[PDB]
Design a binder for this molecule. Structure first.
Ligand SMILES: *C(=O)C[C@H](N)C(=O)O
Ligand SMILES: *C(=O)C[C@H](N)C(=O)O
Ligand code: NA
Ligand code: NA
Lengths: 295, 295
């Protein structure tokens, strides 16, 4: 029975306000520890990614759930997906509004429908058929987020390997600032925002959405690891393709079936946190990595 | 320069009856003809793939545009996507209602917006903006799918290689009969419903949209070519893999950057036709082909 691991990332974009970093740091730790706390009790790779991502949605410092950036009409529309490595089972929602937790709805899509993908009104209905609390829009909308939209008007993920050596991903996002209404990114789209397969590993992505879809970044990262490259080599290879081919930046986290993991980005920043052997690893900027004890 | 080629399909389905056999032949013949004429007139692969899919969207005999399957409510909900392998520019739309040509709306998302995928409410807002008319959903409803939905309770695509060397795909569908409101299959997801790359090939797929999405079928088929599998071996393994791993069945059409092409399927039947070197190739059944001359 293998040594478990969760990795966590928190949108990969431009440089961040130095004070806000403490708040971002503590958010990464929290998701990781929750994710790890779920593995600790021999809990599944699927159980774990979902719990980590639930925490970040609820954390307003991150652009998924509460903290979601705004669309062109000042509102919050959100995307998500989850995948089970074992039989490649999956669930996703795109363009949902006025619920708290997108990643759980995707899991509701995954295990409680014969389908994999619901969108907009059909998913607003499905959430209501599943007893999902509608929350006020003012709660999901923060102040910093109204500010970013004005200045333009002038993503989070988790991967995990459980004790049985199954793998899973979860990705969740409010989208991209000043996006059109109905705009779908790479997040809810299997093989682009994430992919998990026990025979390879699992990956969650963040970056220029369109560019992530265009190249299918998550499956591609995996294409390589099957070919024999390292996690770090494969992450290098795919992110560079996304830059060299479609002129797009982004970030990724992967853990393979051997339990080897890395977090790599061609964006300016990508806060990340991995937990493995009771030791938490954290970072926001390239080549500055801390390690602390997990209680 | 490259001799151009178009391959078309609807839909990797079950047994086809004698009366349907012939209309279906005529529809395929017409769509392959529209595409090849565009390529013979100097048009791009994208023009040619958009060309042929509109022909099957317009034709009531095919599950896409008019004649699409009806959802759970007795309403037509449509997905389509288009991709050029030159720069990986793409457009896609999900759960689109009350419109003739979802693929035409998919092209405009690629061409007129900074996005590559739109859905439902947002899909329609952008539609109305671009002047796409609104037609009563009823006018897409056929007594065939009407009957089929009452009973159930109790897909189209093309690949092209052009005289400039450009490849492309387009895919549109009404989905699976009686789908949940806002279910979204493969057909608008890049990598699943199709993929185009000027440096490898182009692929358009069909059948069970849930399975196609998990194995990332279209892009799976292209990794197999990248490893120097002929277009036939590449279809057979990637279809071979969906079958065993998720127990999915469907079919595809694929074209290499050099002009090699194939239609395989694992369902019982798949309408397909192909025009290259002045001839038409057509089928429904395994090796039922008739190769004629084309004026
Ligand atoms: C998150 O980083 C952005 C996401 N990839 C998207 O929705 O485009
Ligand atoms: C058409 O049968 C295939 C399509 N992939 C779907 O939505 O089921
Ligand atoms: Na959040
Ligand atoms: Na049709």
């Amino acid at each position: 029975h293998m040594n478990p691991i969760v990795v966590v990332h928190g949108g990969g974009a431009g440089p961040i306000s130095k004070d806000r970093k403490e708040r971002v740091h503590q958010g990464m730790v929290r998701a990781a520890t929750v994710g790890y706390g779920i593995l600790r009790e021999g809990g599944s790779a699927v159980d774990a990614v979902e719990g980590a991502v639930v925490a970040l949605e609820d954390d307003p410092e991150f652009n998924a759930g509460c903290g979601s950036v705004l669309n062109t009409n000042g509102e919050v529309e959100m995307d998500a997906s989850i995948m089970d490595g074992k039989d490649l089972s999956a669930g996703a929602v795109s363009a949902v509004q006025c619920i708290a937790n997108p990643i759980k709805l995707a899991r509701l899509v995954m295990e409680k429908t014969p389908h994999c993908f619901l969108t907009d009104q059909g998913a607003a209905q499905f959430a209501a058929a599943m007893g999902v609390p509608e929350i006020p829009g003012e709660k999901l909308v923060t102040e910093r987020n109204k500010k970013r939209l004005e200045k333009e008007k002038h993503t989070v993920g988790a991967v995990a390997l459980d004790c049985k050596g199954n793998v899973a991903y979860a990705t969740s996002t409010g989208g991209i600032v000043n996006k059109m209404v109905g705009r779908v990114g790479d997040s809810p789209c299997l093989g682009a925002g994430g992919y998990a397969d026990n025979d390879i590993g699992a990956v969650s992505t963040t970056g220029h959405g369109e560019s992530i879809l265009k190249v299918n970044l998550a499956r591609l990262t995996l294409f390589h690891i099957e070919q024999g490259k390292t996690v770090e080599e494969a992450a290098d290879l795919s992110l560079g393709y996304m830059k060299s081919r479609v002129k797009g930046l982004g970030g990724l986290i992967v853990v393979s079936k051997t339990g080897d993991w890395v977090a790599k980005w061609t964006s300016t920043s990508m806060p990340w946190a991995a937990a493995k052997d009771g030791k938490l690893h954290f970072g926001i900027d390239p080549d500055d990595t801390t390690i602390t004890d997990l209680p």
